């Protein structure tokens, strides 16, 4: 009779993360929808054929979190290896440290700041706003990091990256960086961090490897959802594609950002000696460049070429994938209808809104496990398994 | 009749791993004499009082190794941290990444550096020598890192840290520093690295747990080998001592740099915001500054109180402890005189030299154990289990 127990649609880390716990925990069989010609989502890797190197294909993948449940959860399919993520910053001509620490000031400012000397020069330099008052990203950076250092390393990058006044854009998306006052310049400061032993996409593979879970690429959920659901028609629905496109636009275009890649393989060995680079300044059209060889130095890759990787950012169109929401105070305002007509589908054919795209949220992996652990845990499970109502 | 089947002289990594290999593997009461009131020679460590905080009492101590057998065999007296070690210098008022990197080069030079960029401005001013044909201290370094960078990093350090003409000091000196040409700014490059979990002295005073070995504090060996040999006749000795002090310096002063430290508790958090800080400039009497809450960041300590320490180096007096062996061609000729007549009472009186002080050698914690597994597989065992003689 009922063939399958719930529809997922988009194989990230939040739709696996779901049909893994559902056909695990509960026994029940899962299908799978996946639009792309690969599962994983942007955390899709591939091994680039001359060199070896594994490319993560949408950009780079960093896995970090300070949550000891996530952490203990991800580390059932797959290694992790002692990778430290950081990141340098290209401005003028010169790479600096990043971010915000002693290496950033001292170099920037041409001297020595002691942790108490650098402390005082920043609150003068950001004595304009104080944090707590912070509204948007501008005010947000310069009340951490003082105007000078705003105008060097943040100004120029969230143009390129965003094209979206900074005035309007949220605080949010600038404390995603660490601000410190020692020369510790790790780009993250989560308790637990690295990269799959194996890569990511033999990580995502085992998630979605138990034989109760079905994944059908190639499949857009639009197409195949009114020939499936009677086919199973007690069987719920997690939802992780674009949440307007879901409701065709009908309230408006929520604002994104897309993003579009340049693989080069270079006869030379290294290209910046370093994993991410960062260009903040406006005289260049990346936001930054990837060099995956970097990222495994564990593995001894062949030392004749290497694979760098430069990023571009613009706005989504129509058809484009969207990468990052904008979420200004327009976008906002959108997603609050959005939210109403979500709140609608779900008590009317029991349809869940989840993941970066489902929610219009800057998401990161662990955010998006975490979140799809919740959704399993106070809402799927007992739905599933003790007849309790999505709501 | 026979109370001990070992004597072993410093209860240092070299001595408590001999203690505990011949202890714990063949069974046999071993007697450790100490002649400090505490076990562990340089590596022992103490909280400091006011804040809790541990101290490396003489000199920063970070264990690290590429040898598998080594880092196998220390896990099971202690656990390790995350840590890993790096160190930044002091330069005309400005901090510096170090060692050679892209961020050295980048800082000191004042642009940005490709890898092939650095790759030839350094072969530039590394013109005058070549590598292979590096003699001493002086020349190895220029034919590494070039002179101007020589000149502002290691000319004034070692100056203040050896006394010595860098022209008669060993190659291998300076080689103890990685040369990179990335961004990587790891003071050390082995595969294994980090700090004791619980300590040093708890890792130490696990070595020397066993009930077969007895260590006594406070006892000079010369001071007791007349009366306990006696007691013990057919028991061998693993001196670990000065090599040189052991004949009474009949043959001649060994060259030996010693250290004074100075401990002070800071009314403020942080002080330098990092671990290590070298001074490379001569108009600052101490070669580096030890910030220890920075060896630690796993552990939470108090924010209004830090422990520093300043370090001093200069020539070991008669009744100084040695810290580092010279060797100088003057020094590594009285060496082998030394050599001769410890290898005549190896076969007049079993008595062994190992260790950093009993074979004039700059010998890491690692490379310590490591000598005495070596002395113990090699030598030792086959003696005290197959009557094998020690030569
Ligand atoms: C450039 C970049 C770098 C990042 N780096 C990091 C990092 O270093 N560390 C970190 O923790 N996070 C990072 N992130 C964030 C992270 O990638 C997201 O959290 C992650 O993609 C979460 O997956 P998601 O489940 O929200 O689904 P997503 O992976 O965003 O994708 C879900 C899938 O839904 C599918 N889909 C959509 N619509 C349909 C449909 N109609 N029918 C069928 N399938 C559909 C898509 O094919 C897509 O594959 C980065 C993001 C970007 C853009
Ligand atoms: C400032 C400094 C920093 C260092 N940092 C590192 C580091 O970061 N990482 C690393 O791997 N290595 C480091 N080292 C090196 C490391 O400390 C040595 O390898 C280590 O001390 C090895 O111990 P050892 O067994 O050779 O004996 P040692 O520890 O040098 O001491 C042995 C003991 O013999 C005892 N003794 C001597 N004579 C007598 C006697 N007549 N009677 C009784 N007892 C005696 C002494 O009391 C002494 O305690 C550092 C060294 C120094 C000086
Ligand atoms: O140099 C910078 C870096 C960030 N920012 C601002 O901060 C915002 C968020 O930065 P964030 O680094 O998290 O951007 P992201 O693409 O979401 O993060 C990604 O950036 C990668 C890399 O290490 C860093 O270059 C990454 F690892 F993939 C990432 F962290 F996921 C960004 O939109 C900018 O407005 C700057 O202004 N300048
Ligand atoms: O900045 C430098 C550093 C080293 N050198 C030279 O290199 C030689 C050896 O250096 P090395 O760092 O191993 O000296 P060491 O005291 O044996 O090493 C110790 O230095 C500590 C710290 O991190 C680094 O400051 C340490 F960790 F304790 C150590 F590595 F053990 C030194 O004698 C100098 O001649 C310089 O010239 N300049």
Redesign the pocket.
């Known amino acids: 009779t009922a063939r399958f127990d719930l529809f997922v649609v988009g194989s990230g880390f939040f739709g696996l993360t779901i049909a893994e716990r559902v056909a695990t925990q509960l026994d029940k069989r899962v299908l799978v929808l996946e639009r792309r010609p690969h599962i994983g989502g942007n955390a899709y890797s591939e091994a680039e054929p001359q060199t070896g190197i594994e490319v993560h294909k949408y950009?780079?993948?960093?896995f970090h979190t300070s949550n000891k449940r996530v952490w203990d959860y991800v580390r059932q399919f797959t290694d992790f290896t002692d990778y430290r993520?950081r990141?340098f910053?290209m401005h003028n001509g010169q790479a600096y440290q990043?971010?915000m620490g002693l290496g950033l000031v001292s170099q920037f400012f041409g001297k020595y700041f002691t942790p108490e000397q650098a402390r005082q020069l920043i609150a003068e330099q950001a004595a304009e706003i104080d944090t707590a008052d912070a509204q948007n990203?501008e005010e947000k950076?310069i009340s951490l990091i003082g105007r000078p250092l705003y105008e060097a390393?943040?100004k120029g990058?969230?143009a390129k990256?965003?094209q979206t006044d900074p005035k309007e854009?949220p605080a949010a998306?600038?404390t995603?960086?660490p601000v410190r006052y020692t020369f510790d310049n790790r780009?993250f400061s989560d308790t637990y961090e690295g990269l799959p032993t194996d890569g990511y996409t033999a990580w995502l593979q085992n998630m979605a490897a138990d034989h109760r879970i079905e994944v059908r690429l190639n499949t857009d959920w639009f197409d195949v959802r009114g020939q499936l659901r009677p086919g199973s028609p007690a069987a719920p629905v997690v939802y992780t594609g674009p949440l307007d496109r879901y409701f065709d636009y009908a309230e408006g275009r929520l604002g994104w950002r897309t993003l579009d890649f340049e693989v080069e393989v270079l006869p030379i060995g290294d290209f910046q000696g370093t994993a991410?680079m960062?260009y903040?300044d406006l005289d260049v059209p990346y936001t930054?460049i990837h060099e995956f060889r970097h990222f495994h130095p564990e593995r001894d890759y062949r030392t004749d070429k290497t694979v760098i990787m430069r990023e571009y950012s613009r706005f989504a169109e129509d058809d484009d994938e969207p990468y990052?929401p904008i979420n200004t105070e327009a976008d906002r305002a959108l997603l609050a209808t959005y939210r109403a007509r979500a709140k609608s589908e779900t008590a009317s054919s029991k349809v869940l809104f989840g993941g970066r795209l489902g929610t219009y949220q800057y998401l990161?992996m662990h955010m998006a496990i975490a979140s799809a652990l919740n959704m399993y845990d106070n809402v799927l499970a007992p739905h599933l398994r003790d007849g309790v109502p999505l709501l």
Do not use: E, K, M, S
Not at 59 to 62: E, F, V
């Open positions: 950009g780079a993948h960093l993520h990141v910053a990043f971010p990203l950076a390393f943040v990058y969230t990256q965003w854009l998306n600038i995603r960086l780009y991410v960062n903040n930054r990052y990161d």
